[PDB]
Design a protein around this ligand. Structure first.
Ligand SMILES: [Mg+2]
Length: 141
DNA sequence: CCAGCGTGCAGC
DNA sequence: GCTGCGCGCTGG
């Protein structure tokens, strides 16, 4: 399952191979523009390349990175706990994890697994991708 | 100038 | 169901 690239360039399209990273991206984009968030995301993944590492992080360090994005303390603590549960808790869908809601979940079920037909998103960008996909899937296979 | 917004979410 | 978290960007 390789979700296709779209004319809307959701960052999920390039991060689907690694659900932890895709899901971290969703968190980064919580009421934050991609213009601001996505450059910080690469710095974050540089310092914390995986959930194995991130769940050991000092949340104050993470907060320093998030400072320009707003929601810096909330999200930094969420990121460390989310990463912890991602690896340690039994889950089937990541909505079961702290810090992931419907939008993150929908992103997961569209990009990381082949369940896009079953998803009913309520997020504007995601709907654009998801609607577009219903219209072009036969054409793309 | 500065109010509205940004690919939300958990807690209550 | 509502609210707090929160910065920089935007555009009249
Ligand atoms: Mg959750």
């Amino acid at each position: 399952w390789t979700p296709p690239r779209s004319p809307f360039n959701l960052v999920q399209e390039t991060l689907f191979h690694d659900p932890w990273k895709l899901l971290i991206a969703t968190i980064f984009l919580n009421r934050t523009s991609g213009k601001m968030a996505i450059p910080v995301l690469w710095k974050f993944l540089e310092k914390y390349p995986s959930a194995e590492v991130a769940r050991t992080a000092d949340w104050r360090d993470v907060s320093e990175l998030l400072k320009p994005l707003g929601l810096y303390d909330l999200r930094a603590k969420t990121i460390v706990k989310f990463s912890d549960e991602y690896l340690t808790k039994q889950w089937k869908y990541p909505i079961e994890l702290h810090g992931i809601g419907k939008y993150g979940n929908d992103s997961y079920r569209i990009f990381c697994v082949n369940e896009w037909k079953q998803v009913h998103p309520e997020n504007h960008k995601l709907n654009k991708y998801h609607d577009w996909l219903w219209e072009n899937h036969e054409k793309l296979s």
